Amino acid sequence: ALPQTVRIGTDTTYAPFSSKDAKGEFIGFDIDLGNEMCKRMQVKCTWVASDFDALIPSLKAKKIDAIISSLSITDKRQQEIAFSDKLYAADSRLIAAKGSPIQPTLESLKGKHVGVLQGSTQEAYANDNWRTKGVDVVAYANQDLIYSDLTAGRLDAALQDEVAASEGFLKQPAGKEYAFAGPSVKDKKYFGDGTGVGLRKDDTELKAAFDKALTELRQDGTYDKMAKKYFDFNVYGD
């Protein structure tokens, strides 16, 4: 008994995973994976755009049936929702102006203004570790606002998923004068293990269908065909 239409929520400000083109159509690797899985599940799927911090509330309230939005699988989130198997890996990394001395450390960042997406694992990490100790951690409604304020000089640094910053900003016109500041921030407790489809705990039939379709499209080589459209390295990690 899967729904006739599966309603999938995503936050369309995280290119190359989820964004909108000039006509307002949904585009990106998350959209490609969701649509291929819906095709293999033989269900119809509707995409619903939402701010990132409204996604798990909307899911719990049944306004959407699944979340595909670079949603990291963490211990905290598993207390509330269920996840498909891993869609791809996601590490966190700081970005700042080229030549910046900034490092992901308290000593480097105390007194700096650091942007993080509201509702993200990065906001959790930065609030506990940095905001309490005097770093000015600023939470934003979406990631595009973070990049705009960084280039405006209102932020000194921003923490987000590494590949989103790389492909969605650093390799773009707008990020030419910016770079990663230090290596990926590893913290198992905060950042979890890769991203997955977020689902209500009791929708075990829907999880089984997403997991089976994901195995099948990885198996026959469709995942790698799709990933190569955006990435030249293995995004899945393994």
Ligand X SMILES: N[C@@H](CCCC[NH3+])C(=O)O
Footprint on this chain of ligand X (rule: CB under 6 A): 11, 14, 52, 69-72, 90, 117, 120-121, 161
* CA 106 vs CA 53, 114, 155, 183, 192: distances in Å: 26, 12, 16, 15, 22
Whose tokens are 């269900």? That residue is 43
Distance between CA 142 and CA 153 in Å, rounded? 18
For 9, other C-beta atoms within 10 Å of its C-beta total 26
The distance of closest approach from Cβ of residue 123 to ligand X in the complex, given in angstroms and rounded to an integer, is: 8
Whether 11 has a binding-site annotation, put simply, is: yes
Decide: helix, strand or coil at residue 199: strand
Whether 166 has a binding-site annotation, put simply, is: no
The distance of closest approach from Cβ of residue 18 to ligand X in the complex, given in angstroms and rounded to an integer, is: 7
Shorter beta-carbon distance to ligand X: residue 13 or 108: 13
Q: Is the dihedral of CA 150, 154, 160, 162 positive or negative?
A: positive
- Cis (ω within 30 of 0) for the bond into 16? yes
Shorter beta-carbon distance to ligand X: residue 6 or 116: 116
Whether 218 has a binding-site annotation, put simply, is: no
The distance of closest approach from Cβ of residue 142 to ligand X in the complex, given in angstroms and rounded to an integer, is: 8
Shorter beta-carbon distance to ligand X: residue 156 or 161: 161
Shorter beta-carbon distance to ligand X: residue 69 or 129: 69
Task: Select from 177, 153, 141, 180 the least CA-distant residue to 164.
Answer: 180
Whether 70 has a binding-site annotation, put simply, is: yes
Shorter beta-carbon distance to ligand X: residue 47 or 52: 52
The distance of closest approach from Cβ of residue 102 to ligand X in the complex, given in angstroms and rounded to an integer, is: 20
Whether 161 has a binding-site annotation, put simply, is: yes
The distance of closest approach from Cβ of residue 88 to ligand X in the complex, given in angstroms and rounded to an integer, is: 10
Whether 40 has a binding-site annotation, put simply, is: no
| Helix ranges restricted to H, the chain | 29-41, 55-60, 75-78, 106-109, 121-129, 143-151, 162-165, 188-191, 204-219, 222-228
Whether 121 has a binding-site annotation, put simply, is: yes
> Which amino acids are annotated as binding site for L-lysine, given as ranges?
11, 70, 72, 77, 121
> Which amino acids are annotated as binding site for L-arginine, given as ranges?
11, 69-70, 72, 77, 121, 161
> Which amino acids are annotated as binding site, given as ranges?
11, 69-70, 72, 77, 121, 161
